[PDB]
Amino acid sequence: QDWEQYRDRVNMLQQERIRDSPLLQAAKENDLRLLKILLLNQSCDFQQRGAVGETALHVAALYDNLEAATLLMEAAPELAKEPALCEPFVGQTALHIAVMNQNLNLVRALLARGASVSARATGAAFRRSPHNLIYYGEHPLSFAACVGSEEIVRLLIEHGADIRAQDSLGNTVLHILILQPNKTFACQMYNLLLSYDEHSDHLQSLELVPNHQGLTPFKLAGVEGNTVMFQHLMQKRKHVQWTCGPLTSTLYDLTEIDSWGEELSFLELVVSSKKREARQILEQTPVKELVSFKWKKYGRPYFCVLASLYILYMICFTTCCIYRPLKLRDDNRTDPRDITILQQKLLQEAYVTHQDNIRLVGELVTVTGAVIILLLEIPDIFRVGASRYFGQTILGGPFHVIIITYASLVLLTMVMRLTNMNGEVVPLSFALVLGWCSVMYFARGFQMLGPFTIMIQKMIFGDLMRFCWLMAVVILGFASAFHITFQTEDPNNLGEFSDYPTALFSTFELFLTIIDGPANYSVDLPFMYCITYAAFAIIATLLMLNLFIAMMGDTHWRVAQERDELWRAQVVATTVMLERKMPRFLWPRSGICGYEYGLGDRWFLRVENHHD
Amino acid sequence: QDWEQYRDRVNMLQQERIRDSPLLQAAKENDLRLLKILLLNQSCDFQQRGAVGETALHVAALYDNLEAATLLMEAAPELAKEPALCEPFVGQTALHIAVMNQNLNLVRALLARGASVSARATGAAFRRSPHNLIYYGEHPLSFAACVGSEEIVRLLIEHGADIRAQDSLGNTVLHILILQPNKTFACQMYNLLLSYDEHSDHLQSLELVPNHQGLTPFKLAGVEGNTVMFQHLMQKRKHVQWTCGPLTSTLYDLTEIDSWGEELSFLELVVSSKKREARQILEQTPVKELVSFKWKKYGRPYFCVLASLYILYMICFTTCCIYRPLKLRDDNRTDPRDITILQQKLLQEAYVTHQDNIRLVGELVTVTGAVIILLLEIPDIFRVGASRYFGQTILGGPFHVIIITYASLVLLTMVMRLTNMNGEVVPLSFALVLGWCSVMYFARGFQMLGPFTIMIQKMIFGDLMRFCWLMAVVILGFASAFHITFQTEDPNNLGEFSDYPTALFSTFELFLTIIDGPANYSVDLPFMYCITYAAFAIIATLLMLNLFIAMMGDTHWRVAQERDELWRAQVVATTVMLERKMPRFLWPRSGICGYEYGLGDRWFLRVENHHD
């Protein structure tokens, strides 16, 4: 059974146990005269509870029932200190429900009886999951902040709600307010929750408090892509120096944005976030002015020096493939089997030569330039986690599949050499088409080339390989039918389909109109051919090819804002990649320091504005 | 004569007979002094009636004439009990007209004289037809509900209007309110017509009353696509269990939506509806949450198990086509007629062999896997009606034309075998291109492949075969003209047009630039060729091919909301198809039952909401 069906059994078995007992019946129905009578003559022992394990008070708080609840607490005093007991509702007190329904008079009535305001609702239906429509945390202060009920919030603070409290994820009440969809009402709640944090310096204050995955709520607003709360959290960390007319020289703090950190860099988490909304933090005014300084001053020359060291690396690898030790075919084995074209095989003659030692010091460049690649990718596998790292298409993406499989095939050819293995062309041909299609990684400068190579990377994953599947259906229907009409025939005349692997290959080529129509006019092709070929030509190159241009040319102007927004986020991911790797003998820390211009020890960035 | 012109003769001959008699003249003109005089001295016998057969009262009610009507009823008492008599206006009383014009004081004056409120207007102009701008039913209560006149409605109820009455289609007054274009004013009328239905249990109440085609008005609102009345009819059949903050766990009844029925399944009628608006019932909140549970829990694994049994079926059919009994050409008949390519013919050697018995148990799979297909399509022909079933493109569509013509051609080849008929390639080549283009049916999972194969199915019916017709015009103009310039010439040099069926085929190929331009440079082609070929190349592959991409690439982004909405409705039609076919040892009934969680015997679906 699914967990979705398992909780539907629970949320309906609760409704059976309400109807079975007349106490929980009248609790949700607010029958005052029944409760004044049912609690006199041997008032029932309240171990009789619901199916989840809740009292009559959790039922009478699940519905807006003040008078039904106060008559429960006067007769039975010990109900507000009682949690629900089922496994997806652990610890949900009556206070956790009265807060959610914004029932003002009930929370006053629960807290005056001494309800625990620090009870954790550790149920499996309260945790953050894609099949839970809310994530409001565990504590009732975290429930009050997320329903936007500011009167319940400060009512809890007056009775001892701890704003520094963390739930099973470690999310404080500020982490949870960022995760809410109602973004514009969480900035007003964030201002309210700081003014009751007069207490200071216990653990880096209320805001810089980390998660269990290390995310401070400033750093979480970048991962989540909460640009509304991001600008709110920046108001504390900017200084307006002067206003000379329409100009405004504001001075951002750039301490929690910039890494001087070890591995929890803020800009690493934004660009590598799975959330789609996170690519808008990279356009916010202390960040956009920062990563445009890192890129243009340092990142763009260091990426173009390093792009031409890789073009010179591949142009050194082809010439050591072109020049390769091929002898002269020392056999008469081509005299049998006249269908064989082949000539010279391979050599173990890197030594007895003059111009194969020029080649040898160009093969040692490619061997010790593809072990360099493996020493720059494999320690970057284990940092991200090997599954996120190959699928981002911002954070490198499927150019690390290519650059590892390139450099693997250069090292296979090294083992194809030195052991005199024959089929050395087979990793050389794959390394050449992958080593050059890895030069296309370095279009991540180059606004000219930038968004165009994302569209290649996007039309190859969505739009080509949904056309590819219904190519294979068509070029197996016809390829297997062209093989049947010419199985009868003589393959010296029109031998395009002489074999079943070649009938698949000739029809795939015919599907793209590269190979011409198989036609010999000095002989009589079978009449079944021109019927199948009339049908093929209409399906293949009227319909299926030109509809592919429509799929291609329609889903292209859809992704026009989105292929260009994804390139601006791909330049940021390139800069952040680069500043990890190349040492600091290179990039001095961004922004102007603060102990020379003595006000602090922080590293500020100056931005001047213009009031339109 | 058309019926449109025949009723225009009627609606104008009525206007002649008004002008001829001075009584019906002054009835529509409201001349009070004439009617007080024309009814004294031998008041005219009112068998004198109009051309339709109406009295002066139906004329004086067709126009808003109170005082002209009351002077008719005082002098002639017996006029309100008199119907119109022409064949497209049968039974239309004066009450059927005064109700339509919302004439409040006239309906009070007719009913006080004892007008029949249960008269059926059985005219041929009142029936539901595409050339009738209204369908308001037969009874005057059905006329009052459709003009939105709530005061006339309850005035009829006080005098004995039967809300359970049915017209010649069997439509009750609730069936007719769903068929109205004025949808938002029929929900207010539907609330009014239930409160005068206090009487209960005569025939499953007012709402569940069936049509003559079996449609209850709940089930009719799904066929018609009346999503406004669909949500109104669902308010009676949902239970709101609890509201935990923004959550709402409502509990839908799922009795009239789900089939536990025989053949009148609600979701069958929605997806197979000819109405375009019906595909929006599949996005309404008790239905969208239901068919997404049936598909993802049961429907999607059962459709992917059954899609790979069909890929293994076709990949078993090609290998028994590739391997097929071809001998060695035992004749020297290729020594005459050197234009013949052919070699080996056919064999009756499934027996004397070792590796044709492996083929034989793979041909018996294809024979007894294409009689299975005929036993799963032919009893599904007669249920829908053989003409709707092949044209829906949601309800299978033209993948049942293909899967029947596939399985017919496998059984032809079985008769081409066992009788030693020669041309066995001719049904084998057609079965291969149809058996594989039937694998493309199973893209009805697979959101990747789903909407793309509808666009193939849509650009082949609208956009290709309107380009195909004006291909055939062009590739007959030029093919017949390329044949004429080369009829003179010698076919050993440039024999692309050596015959008139090959000139059509070479020009069709030239139209698609598959075959190259026919050009021999060692001989002088006729000068008339390069003039016709310059014209062809401009019309064929500048204009007509690239304008086809424009037709293809323009009508593609038009159908983008509509190819994707039509795939969500095609997954629902797949689920509903599947739950008929595969037995219930498989799909337990959807939704949670009701006698274990004892409140009824109905099968509820729980949906929880989130108030934004």
Q: Which residues contact A63 (CB under 8 A, 6 or more apart)?
A: A28, A30, B242, B243
DSSP-derived pairing of the beta strands A247-252 and B605-610: unpaired
SS3 A489: coil
* The pair of three-digit structure tokens given for residue B29, joined into one six-digit string: 């003109």
What is the spatial distance between Cα B572 and Cα B568, in angstroms, rounded to a whole number? 7
A551-A554-A556 Cα angle (round to 5): 105
- Looking at the complex, report in whole angstroms how far the Cα of residue B427 sits from the nearest Cα belonging to chain A: 10
**DSSP string covering B34-77, please?**
HHHHHTTTT---TT---SSS--HHHHHHHTT-SHHHHHHHHHSS
In chain A, which residues have their Cβ closer than 8 Å to the Cβ of B455?
547, 550-551
Where are the strands (E) in A219-370, listed by range?
238-240, 247-252
Q: In the 8-state DSSP scheme, what is residue B287?
A: T
SS3 B156: helix
Q: How many CA atoms within 13 Å lie on the side-chain side of A258?
A: 22
Residue A610 contacts residue A246 (beta carbons within 8 Å): yes
Q: In what order do the strands lie in the sheet with B605-610?
A: B238-240, B247-252, B605-610
In chain A, which residues have their Cβ closer than 8 Å to the Cβ of B336?
none
What is the spatial distance between Cα B505 and Cα B475, in angstroms, rounded to a whole number? 9
Residue B583 contacts residue B221 (beta carbons within 8 Å): no
Q: Which helix (H) or strand (E) holds B498?
A: none
Residue A246 contacts residue A195 (beta carbons within 8 Å): no
SS3 B553: helix
State the count of interchain CB pairs (< 8 A) between A and B: 211
What is the spatial distance between Cα B216 and Cα A132, in angstroms, rounded to a whole number? 37
**Closest CB from A2, A517, A547 relative to B456:** A547
| H-only helix segments in B158-210 | 173-178, 186-194
* The pair of three-digit structure tokens given for residue B478, joined into one six-digit string: 């030029």
Reported resolution, Å: 3.0
Q: Which residue has the tokens 């994707």?
A: B564
Longest dimension (CA), chain B: 114
What is the spatial distance between Cα A25 and Cα A14, in angstroms, rounded to a whole number? 11
Residue A40 contacts residue A50 (beta carbons within 8 Å): no
**Closest CB from A100, A478, A513 relative to B514:** A513
Q: In the 8-state DSSP scheme, what is residue A588?
A: P
Q: How many CA atoms within 13 Å lie on the side-chain side of B121?
A: 24
Cβ contact, residue pair B426, A516, below 8 Å: no
What is the spatial distance between Cα B176 and Cα B307, in angstroms, rounded to a whole number? 43
**Domain interval for residue A115:** 3-252
Nearest C-alpha neighbor of B548 from the set A459, A548, A460: A548
CATH code, domain carrying A151: 1.25.40.20
> Is residue B127 classed exposed, middle or buried when 0-12, 13-18 and 19+ CB atoms within 10 A define those classes?
middle
Residue A57 contacts residue A94 (beta carbons within 8 Å): yes
> Is residue B203 classed exposed, middle or buried when 0-12, 13-18 and 19+ CB atoms within 10 A define those classes?
exposed
Q: Which residue has the tokens 């609760």?
A: A14
Cβ contact, residue pair A554, B553, below 8 Å: yes
In chain B, which residues have their Cβ closer than 8 Å to the Cβ of A12?
241, 251, 592, 597, 604, 606
Nearest C-alpha neighbor of A511 from the set B431, B514, B552: B514
What is the spatial distance between Cα B563 and Cα A339, in angstroms, rounded to a whole number? 51
Gaps in chain A after residue (C–N beyond 2.5 Å):
none
Q: In what order do the strands lie in the sheet with A238-240?
A: A238-240, A247-252, A605-610
What is the spatial distance between Cα A275 and Cα A388, in angstroms, rounded to a whole number? 13
CB atoms within 10 A of CB A82: 19
- Looking at the complex, report in whole angstroms how far the Cα of residue B243 sits from the nearest Cα belonging to chain A: 7
Bridge partners of A606, per DSSP, are A251
- Looking at the complex, report in whole angstroms how far the Cα of residue B269 sits from the nearest Cα belonging to chain A: 28
What is the spatial distance between Cα B386 and Cα B396, in angstroms, rounded to a whole number? 12
What is the spatial distance between Cα A550 and Cα B552, in angstroms, rounded to a whole number? 6
Phi, psi of B604 (to 5 degrees): -90, 155
A321-A326-A327 Cα angle (round to 5): 165
* The pair of three-digit structure tokens given for residue B111, joined into one six-digit string: 């009913």
Residue B589 contacts residue B603 (beta carbons within 8 Å): yes
Nearest C-alpha neighbor of B553 from the set A541, A556, A294: A556
A114: left (phi over 0), alpha (psi -120 to 50) or beta: left
Nearest C-alpha neighbor of B196 from the set B160, B142, B147: B160
First to last CA, chain B: 61
What is the spatial distance between Cα B425 and Cα B413, in angstroms, rounded to a whole number? 9
CA A189, A195, A196, A197 torsion-angle sign: positive
Q: Which residues contact A126 (CB under 8 A, 6 or more apart)?
A: A88, A89, A92, A132, A135, A136, A137, A138
**Closest CB from A11, A478, A538 relative to B606:** A11
If you count DSSP H runs as helices and E runs as strands, how many of each does chain A have, helices first? 28, 3
Q: Which residue has the tokens 């986690």?
A: A385
B-chain residue closest to A61, CA distance: B244
Q: What is the C-alpha radius of gyration for chain A, rounded to an integer number of angstroms? A: 35
CA A36, A41, A42, A47 torsion-angle sign: negative
Cβ contact, residue pair B432, A522, below 8 Å: no
- Looking at the complex, report in whole angstroms how far the Cα of residue A534 sits from the nearest Cα belonging to chain B: 8
Residue B66 contacts residue B109 (beta carbons within 8 Å): yes
Nearest C-alpha neighbor of A319 from the set A369, A360, A370: A360
**Closest CB from B436, B549, B557 relative to A477:** B436
Q: What is the residue type of B134?
A: I
SS3 A95: helix
Nearest C-alpha neighbor of A500 from the set A483, A517, A475: A483
What is the spatial distance between Cα A560 and Cα A310, in angstroms, rounded to a whole number? 30
**CA torsion, ordered A522, A527, A532, A538, to nearest 10 deg:** 70
Known binding positions of A for Ca(2+)? 516
Cβ contact, residue pair B251, A2, below 8 Å: no
**DSSP string covering A152-192, please?**
HHHHHHTTT--TT---TT---HHHHHHT-S-GGGHHHHHHH
In chain B, which residues have their Cβ closer than 8 Å to the Cβ of A549?
549, 552-553
Q: In the 8-state DSSP scheme, what is residue A127?
A: S
Phi, psi of A230 (to 5 degrees): -70, -45
Residue A221 contacts residue A229 (beta carbons within 8 Å): yes
Q: Which residues contact B199 (CB under 8 A, 6 or more apart)?
A: none
Nearest C-alpha neighbor of B568 from the set B409, B454, B431: B454
What is the spatial distance between Cα B467 and Cα A308, in angstroms, rounded to a whole number? 50
What is the spatial distance between Cα B397 and Cα B338, in angstroms, rounded to a whole number? 47
B-chain residue closest to A59, CA distance: B242
A503-A506-A511 Cα angle (round to 5): 120
Work out the angle between the directed axes of helices B67-75 and B22-29 (0-180°, nearest 10).
140
Residue A178 contacts residue A217 (beta carbons within 8 Å): yes
Residue B318 contacts residue B443 (beta carbons within 8 Å): no
Mutation target vs A (from B342, B563, B611; most A CBs, 10 A cutoff): B342
What is the spatial distance between Cα A51 and Cα A89, in angstroms, rounded to a whole number? 11
In whole angstroms, what separates CA B579 from the centre of its chain? 21
In chain A, which residues have their Cβ closer than 8 Å to the Cβ of B320?
none
**Closest CB from A488, A532, A546 relative to B342:** A488
* The pair of three-digit structure tokens given for residue A537, joined into one six-digit string: 């030509």
First to last CA, chain A: 61
CA A560, A561, A565, A568 torsion-angle sign: positive
| H-only helix segments in A323-399 | 357-367, 371-384
Bridge partners of B595, per DSSP, are none
Query: Could you tell me the CA-to-CA distances from A115 to A90, A98, B273 in Å, in that order?
Result: 16, 11, 58
B-chain residue closest to A535, CA distance: B433
In chain B, which residues have their Cβ closer than 8 Å to the Cβ of A29?
none
| H-only helix segments in B88-159 | 95-98, 104-112, 140-146, 150-157
Query: Could you tell me the CA-to-CA distances from A146 to A132, A138, A141, A579 in Å, in that order?
Result: 15, 12, 9, 38
Q: What is the residue type of A82?
A: E
Cβ contact, residue pair B512, A541, below 8 Å: yes
Q: What is the C-alpha radius of gyration for chain B, rounded to an integer number of angstroms? A: 35
What is the spatial distance between Cα B456 and Cα B520, in angstroms, rounded to a whole number? 39
SS3 A572: helix
DSSP-derived pairing of the beta strands B238-240 and A605-610: unpaired
Nearest C-alpha neighbor of B172 from the set B208, B198, B132: B208
**Closest CB from A478, A538, A550 relative to B552:** A550
Residue B610 contacts residue A181 (beta carbons within 8 Å): no
**CA torsion, ordered B564, B569, B572, B574, to nearest 10 deg:** -80
Cβ contact, residue pair A485, B429, below 8 Å: yes
Q: In the 8-state DSSP scheme, what is residue A592?
A: B
Nearest C-alpha neighbor of B472 from the set A525, A540, A538: A538
Cβ contact, residue pair A549, B552, below 8 Å: yes
In chain B, which residues have their Cβ closer than 8 Å to the Cβ of A499?
none
Q: What is the residue type of B606?
A: R
What is the spatial distance between Cα B270 and Cα B573, in angstroms, rounded to a whole number? 9
Work out the angle between the directed axes of helices B527-537 and B479-487 (0-180°, nearest 10).
170
Q: Which residue has the tokens 């002008």?
A: B19
Residue A483 contacts residue A503 (beta carbons within 8 Å): yes
Residue A153 contacts residue A147 (beta carbons within 8 Å): no
Q: Which residues contact B535 (CB under 8 A, 6 or more apart)?
A: B478
Cβ contact, residue pair B599, A16, below 8 Å: yes
Q: What is the residue type of B466?
A: R
